[PDB]
Design an enzyme around this catalytic site. Structure first.
Site, short mmCIF file in Angstrom:
data_model
loop_
_atom_site.label_atom_id
_atom_site.label_comp_id
_atom_site.label_asym_id
_atom_site.label_seq_id
_atom_site.Cartn_x
_atom_site.Cartn_y
_atom_site.Cartn_z
N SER A 135 0.85 -1.21 0.00
CA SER A 135 0.00 0.00 0.00
C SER A 135 0.88 1.25 0.00
O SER A 135 1.79 1.33 -0.83
CB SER A 135 -0.97 -0.10 1.17
OG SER A 135 -0.35 0.36 2.37
N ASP B 140 -10.68 -5.67 -4.30
CA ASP B 140 -10.11 -4.89 -3.21
C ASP B 140 -10.86 -3.57 -3.19
O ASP B 140 -10.80 -2.83 -4.17
CB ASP B 140 -8.60 -4.68 -3.43
CG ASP B 140 -7.96 -3.77 -2.39
OD1 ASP B 140 -8.66 -3.24 -1.50
OD2 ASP B 140 -6.73 -3.58 -2.48
N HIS C 88 -7.50 -6.07 0.90
CA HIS C 88 -6.43 -5.09 0.66
C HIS C 88 -5.09 -5.53 1.24
O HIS C 88 -4.05 -4.97 0.84
CB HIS C 88 -6.81 -3.75 1.29
CG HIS C 88 -5.86 -2.63 0.98
ND1 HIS C 88 -5.49 -2.28 -0.30
CD2 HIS C 88 -5.23 -1.76 1.80
CE1 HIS C 88 -4.67 -1.25 -0.25
NE2 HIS C 88 -4.50 -0.91 1.01
#
Length: 267
Positions: free
Chosen positions: A93, A215, A244
């Site tokens: 991320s 996601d 995620h």
């Protein structure tokens, strides 16, 4: 020391260093299942980004960390400290994005970026679908302060696409609630106010984009958007996974895919 401030951990052995950077709401324990498949072939440097519950509250710079490059510079300073060059950076991320920014300033530090569920922007415009309309986000961010613990209990199962019973959920909430809430919302506000599309064309290091097929923070098309708009070589793997943090929640699919992109190069 910068090693003490980031709980830097060094394991394995090899000519190449793997650097593991955790995402929002976790820490380096999130890699416990991946590391043992790396120690034989690579030396492994793990670290905690500032504001993780395992780092000192007094060392969190609120204005420095309201922007992504606060982490980028932290990352650069860790690699300099531990004398790492041309590493293979594995991030989740935000972490992978900070590393892509760091690779713009100092591309000698990076051999390749292996990114799990990256996104350059969450909020929509008309021509780019990020997954969130500006009005839902601004309304959530405006009142995020007061509703913090309940909003994250209630969204974590959908973020992670996992059951409340699961080991994954138990662990994510462990580390997520390990942060102070004012540090967490700051980081949250930084992440949600992000738009890295102007910068993608300046990234030149090879990029391995690994994504879930479902996601809620990462529309699948955002994956392909990155391969097209990144400045150097690029691959995309849309895994048959959901959520995620698929490295935490579906390690049986995710870890084999991660290891291949670590061990194989596009170029």
């Amino acid at each position: 020391s910068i090693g003490l401030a980031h709980n830097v951990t060094i394991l394995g052995s090899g000519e190449t260093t793997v650097v593991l950077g955790h995402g929002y709401g976790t820490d380096q324990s999130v890699w416990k299942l991946l590391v043992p498949y790396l120690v034989d072939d690579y030396k492994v440097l793990l670290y905690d980004h500032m504001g993780a519950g395992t780092t000192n509250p007094d060392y969190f710079d609120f204005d420095r960390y309201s922007s992504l490059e606060g982490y980028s510079y932290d990352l650069i300073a860790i690699l300099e400290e531990f004398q790492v060059s041309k590493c293979i950076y594995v991030g989740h991320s935000m972490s992978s994005m900070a590393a892509a920014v760091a690779s713009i300033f100092r591309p000698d530090l990076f051999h390749k970026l292996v990114m799990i569920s990256p996104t350059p922007r969450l909020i929509n415009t008309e021509e780019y679908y990020g997954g969130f309309e500006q009005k839902v986000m601004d309304e959530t961010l405006r009142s995020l302060d007061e509703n913090f613990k309940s909003l994250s209990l209630g969204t974590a199962p959908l973020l992670l696409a996992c059951d409340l019973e699961s080991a994954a959920m138990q662990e994510y909430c462990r580390t997520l609630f390990n942060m102070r809430p004012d540090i967490a919302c700051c980081i949250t506000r930084m992440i949600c106010g992000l738009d890295l599309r102007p910068y993608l064309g300046h990234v030149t290091v090879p990029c391995h984009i690994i994504q879930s097929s479902n996601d809620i923070m990462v529309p699948v098309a955002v994956g392909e958007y990155l391969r097209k708009n990144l400045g150097g070589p690029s691959v995309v793997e849309v895994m048959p996974t959901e959520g995620h943090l698929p490295h935490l929640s579906m390690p049986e699919v995710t870890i084999p895919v991660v290891l291949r992109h670590i061990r194989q190069d596009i170029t």
